[PDB]
């Protein structure tokens, strides 16, 4: 019942250094066969109040060896680009705006690995996702290359491959652990529909040490070492079960077409 998800990636480079290397682009493949399998050492980091919640999500991923067309592919597509930046607007989906068009979202996880990423509000960001549902066009997750894999040109605190973990688990149904109140709304108001990560006002950054409570949700506080929320790498270590529902719910609805 392990659903195994072939992945195109889709470097899309401007500078020759951007071009990722394979053995980036491996080790990230390598850490997300750790994390959806629940095989990521740094499981062990998990509160013991949780350590019963932890998912294997049963999920494996590999670099696809046949392209759209049945060809033989690395699984690695590599697009020079005049473009110096992306951003949420996808811009980097379409051959058309200097990226790269997705392959088939039903039989691929289209992942594009570009230098920078912006927000809409022009914040700089390492990654994206699109949930289910969306349009294949641009169906898949886009990350920035210092934060893809655990070599080359990955930086920490992102060079454990948890911003590819934490944007497929959007690719999967997931949301953000602290349930992304805008602003102006109560930061306690917002729920990720997972009963089992705890109400959590706002994303943690860095590794907050815990407990760290938030939404009067002591003594044990945020799961911020959930991979939904926005820790570095390292502090980010698991999925829970109620993701796993969501998450099986997504490959059993949405995105069957993988199993
Ligand atoms: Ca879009
Ligand atoms: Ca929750
Ligand atoms: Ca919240
Ligand atoms: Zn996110």
Same mark, same amino acid.
């Given at each position: 019942?392990?659903?195994?998800?072939?992945?195109?990636?889709?470097?899309? #480079?401007?500078?020759? %250094? %951007?071009?990722?290397?394979?053995?980036?682009?491996?080790?990230?493949?390598?850490?997300?066969?750790?994390?959806?399998?629940?095989?990521?050492?740094?499981?062990?980091?998990?509160?013991?109040?949780?350590?019963?919640?932890?998912?294997?999500?049963?999920?494996?991923?590999?670099?696809?060896?046949?392209?759209?067309?049945?060809? $033989?592919?690395?699984?690695?597509?590599?697009?020079?680009?005049?473009?110096?930046?992306?951003?949420?607007?996808?811009?980097?989906?379409?051959?058309?705006?200097?990226?790269?068009?997705?392959?088939?979202?039903?039989?691929?996880?289209?992942?594009?690995?570009?230098?920078?990423?912006?927000?809409?509000?022009? $914040?700089?960001?390492?990654?994206?996702?699109?949930?289910?549902?969306?349009?294949? %066009?641009?169906?898949?997750?886009?990350?920035?290359?210092?934060?893809?894999?655990?070599?080359?040109?990955?930086?920490?605190?992102?060079?454990?491959?948890?911003?590819?973990?934490?944007?497929?688990?959007?690719?999967?149904?997931?949301?953000?652990? #602290?349930?992304?109140?805008?602003?102006?709304?109560?930061?306690?108001?917002?729920?990720?529909?997972?009963?089992?990560?705890?109400?959590?006002?706002?994303?943690?950054?860095?590794?907050?040490?815990?407990?760290?409570?938030?939404?009067?949700?002591?003594?044990?506080?945020?799961?911020?070492?959930?991979?939904?929320?926005?820790?570095?790498?390292?502090?980010?270590?698991?999925?829970?079960?109620?993701?796993?529902?969501?998450?099986?719910?997504?490959?059993?609805?949405?995105?069957?077409?993988?199993?």
């Amino acid at each position: 019942e392990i659903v195994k998800i072939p992945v195109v990636v889709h470097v899309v #480079w401007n500078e020759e %250094e %951007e071009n990722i290397s394979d053995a980036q682009i491996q080790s990230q493949i390598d850490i997300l066969n750790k994390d959806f399998r629940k095989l990521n050492s740094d499981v062990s980091q998990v509160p013991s109040v949780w350590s019963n919640l932890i998912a294997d999500l049963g999920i494996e991923f590999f670099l696809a060896t046949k392209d759209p067309n049945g060809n $033989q592919t690395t699984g690695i597509t590599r697009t020079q680009t005049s473009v110096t930046f992306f951003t949420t607007s996808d811009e980097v989906k379409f051959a058309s705006s200097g990226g790269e068009d997705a392959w088939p979202a039903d039989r691929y996880l289209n992942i594009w690995v570009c230098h920078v990423l912006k927000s809409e509000i022009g $914040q700089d960001i390492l990654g994206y996702a699109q949930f289910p549902g969306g349009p294949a %066009e641009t169906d898949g997750v886009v990350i920035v290359d210092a934060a893809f894999g655990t070599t080359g040109t990955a930086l920490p605190p992102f060079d454990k491959g948890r911003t590819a973990t934490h944007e497929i688990g959007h690719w999967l149904n997931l949301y953000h652990i #602290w349930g992304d109140e805008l602003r102006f709304e109560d930061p306690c108001s917002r729920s990720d529909e997972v009963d089992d990560t705890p109400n959590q006002a706002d994303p943690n950054f860095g590794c907050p040490s815990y407990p760290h409570v938030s939404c009067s949700n002591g003594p044990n506080g945020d799961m911020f070492m959930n991979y939904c929320d926005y820790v570095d790498d390292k502090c980010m270590v698991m999925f829970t079960q109620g993701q796993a529902t969501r998450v099986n719910a997504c490959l059993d609805g949405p995105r069957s077409s993988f199993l």
